[PDB]
Amino acid sequence: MGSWAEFKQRLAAIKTRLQALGGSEAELAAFEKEIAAFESELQAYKGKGNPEVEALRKEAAAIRDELQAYRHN
Structure with missing residues (x-):
């Protein structure tokens, strides 16, 4: 319901930020x-x-794990 609605917007928020690193x-x-x-x-x-x-x-x-490499990419 509305619960999983906000959880989906968060997974996408990490797709752009980690796109730079x-x-x-x-x-x-x-x-x-x-x-x-x-x-x-x-x-x-x-x-x-x-x-x-x-x-x-x-x-x-x-x-x-994939976020452990972005620390210095």
Whole structure:
């Protein structure tokens, strides 16, 4: 419902910022602070969407490692 509506706008917000990474240190630095709130909120974003947001647990995973290189790309 409206819950997954805002979560979709966030995944797209990281697609543009990480598109540069020329600044990196000041760009994907806040990124790490994001994926962190993606787990604690994944359960508190609604009654308890475990399977629903579950798919977002596999995609957000690759969003962390690939972000380790942008730190200095």
